[PDB]
Ligand binder design. Structure first.
Ligand code: WB0
Ligand code: WB0
Ligand code: CL
Ligand code: CL
Ligand code: CL
Ligand code: CL
Ligand code: NA
Ligand code: NA
Lengths: 302, 302
């Protein structure tokens, strides 16, 4: 028992992290087979970053402008190209530690593990959720750009995120591994604002089920509400509306605990309207929305 | 910026996890050089577990009773011995992925990363603190015993914890890698209770400094208290007393933020006496005590 924010084991990804240097800019890259992927803004100077024209900047580069280091072993760049906001550097050596992998774009409300890296060296691993406004609330310092997010499914790594920038609000924005930004952001050093965020309702319900599985029952009640009457309460508290497919996704947890989804929604309605009155749920005094139903099932099997 | 519970990258440890089977009991072991370390209770049957005499049970075992699998490759056991509560199985192959490592015993109030494993296969990684009562609040299901906790310092892995059991309260107990239990526990299937726990004061202050570094300042005030007058408040709220060495350990963070330690203690006194009045600190509505000063500095460098 117990319930923790749990990242995937990071070993398969650690073997892929490299350092990419162009001029005086150094960030992280991802070395899979004979290609290194990294944020294209590595080619910009401090002046370029305000309003870069990346097509012009790349045409002015050559292979020998790119320094790639995998540990202390330098990798020779034999080709460079751009795909959306990612740079692809072809190298003369295939990474012998390339895992089975896929490039997948995730949905808001889904979670993934982040391997925070600096100068090509992994420093820590943690879970992130993609917010409804396409930002993530990560932990990143200067030098972290090019760090990647991923999920692992039967030894296949699904890469879903490459880190590009911290916004002025301290939240974080990046792309999928095809270089397409999550959300309404661009890779230039200008102040950009995310849209308004909302709380991920299905994840809060999943976490309430985790809590019941782990023995926290004080918030349960004998009431049951309707999907429509709950969604009226959700809108008032800036929660995403609940759909029938969310109820279906929550079916397994509802069956394991014997608490119908709409019964748990009555508990959530009361928690939103009255607070916790000084009590905690799974060690939190707030309603947690960064665990998916899958995260709960993976950790609360027993 | 941002502040997250961050584990160490787990790759160096993943390469050491194996499966150890004795009879119908399967758990995890740690394969370093030509030795596999695992909980000695793998040699017990269901009946033995109530009141095992491990010296008798081990003398009745032979090498061929132990099945060790590293992935799908079976390792041949060529010797067995017991050190306190850990079994040491000598194998005919040195682990080619053995990292530089040390066996270190940690102190209550310190943190470490846990690689949760099942059947020798790593499933997730997360941070734990050793509670003042020598338990950890982990996330472990059946089959997790033998999972290890560790810190990493300049590519040297310091192993500090091997998981042995879940207590009836749902918290977790284990040993150092010499097999010596943390706290007043024994490896037998009987109900055992931990001593009363307390909140780790220096860690709460470290986390308040993290919050200031990240822009949460609402709890600051112009007041400053004395070490003695704060410790009077600490005792009332079941907080560990603050020592001058704790003030010294907090010096670097105090200098980086410009907030004297005893000034931050005045803030903590007010937070304990009045609550948060509906506000949050680093995304929590509770005072967090599972980050050490080192954890904060490692993540809040910038
Ligand atoms: C208090 N917040 C900050 O100071 C972070 C500032 C916020 C800010 C944003 C826009 C602006 F006009 C003024 C300030 N952001 C950065 O400075 C960005 C600048 C940038 C560079 C490349 C590209 Cl394509 C876009 C941008 Cl916008 N630099 C990075 O993200 C670094 N690579 C990583 C980094 C460095 C330092 C701190 C955190 C992180 C991280 N993670
Ligand atoms: C609601 N809580 C539980 O049901 C867990 C129970 C609590 C309980 C404790 C004592 C008792 F008399 C009755 C119940 N504990 C276990 O059943 C232990 C039994 C045990 C075995 C070997 C050794 Cl040396 C000591 C013990 Cl005590 N089994 C394990 O820890 C497993 N290896 C791992 C495990 C299995 C299942 C659930 C969580 C975990 C984990 N992690
Ligand atoms: Cl957590
Ligand atoms: Cl793909
Ligand atoms: Cl966290
Ligand atoms: Cl040692
Ligand atoms: Na493609
Ligand atoms: Na020794």
């Amino acid at each position: 028992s117990g319930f923790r924010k749990m990242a995937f084991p990071s070993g398969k990804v650690e073997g892929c992290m490299v350092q990419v240097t162009c001029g005086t800019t150094t960030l992280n890259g991802l070395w899979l087979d004979d290609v290194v992927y990294c944020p294209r803004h590595v080619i910009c100077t401090s002046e370029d970053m305000l309003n870069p024209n990346y097509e012009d900047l790349l045409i002015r580069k050559s292979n020998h402008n790119f320094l790639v280091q995998a540990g202390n072993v330098q990798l020779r760049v034999i080709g460079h190209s751009m795909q959306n906001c990612v740079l692809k550097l072809k190298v003369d050596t295939a990474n012998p530690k390339t895992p089975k992998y896929k490039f997948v774009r995730i949905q808001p409300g889904q979670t993934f593990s982040v391997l925070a890296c600096y100068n090509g060296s992994p420093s820590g691993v943690y879970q992130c959720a993609m917010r409804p406004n396409f930002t993530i609330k990560g932990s990143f310092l200067n030098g972290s750009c090019g760090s990647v997010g991923f999920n692992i499914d039967y030894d296949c790594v699904s890469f879903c995120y490459m880190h590009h920038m911290e916004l002025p609000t301290g939240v974080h924005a990046g792309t999928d591994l095809e270089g397409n930004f999550y959300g309404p952001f661009v890779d230039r050093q200008t102040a950009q604002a995310a849209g308004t965020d909302t709380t991920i309702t299905v994840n809060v319900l999943a976490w309430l089920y985790a809590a019941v599985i782990n023995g926290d029952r004080w918030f349960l009640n004998r009431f049951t509400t309707t999907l429509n009457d709950f969604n009226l309460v959700a809108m008032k508290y800036n929660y995403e509306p609940l759909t029938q497919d969310h109820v279906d996704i929550l079916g397994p947890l509802s069956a394991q605990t014997g608490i119908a989804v709409l019964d748990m929604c009555a508990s959530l309605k009361e928690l939103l309207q009255n607070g916790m009155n000084g009590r905690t749920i799974l060690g939190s005094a707030l309603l947690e929305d960064e665990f998916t139903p899958f995260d709960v099932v993976r950790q609360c099997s027993g």
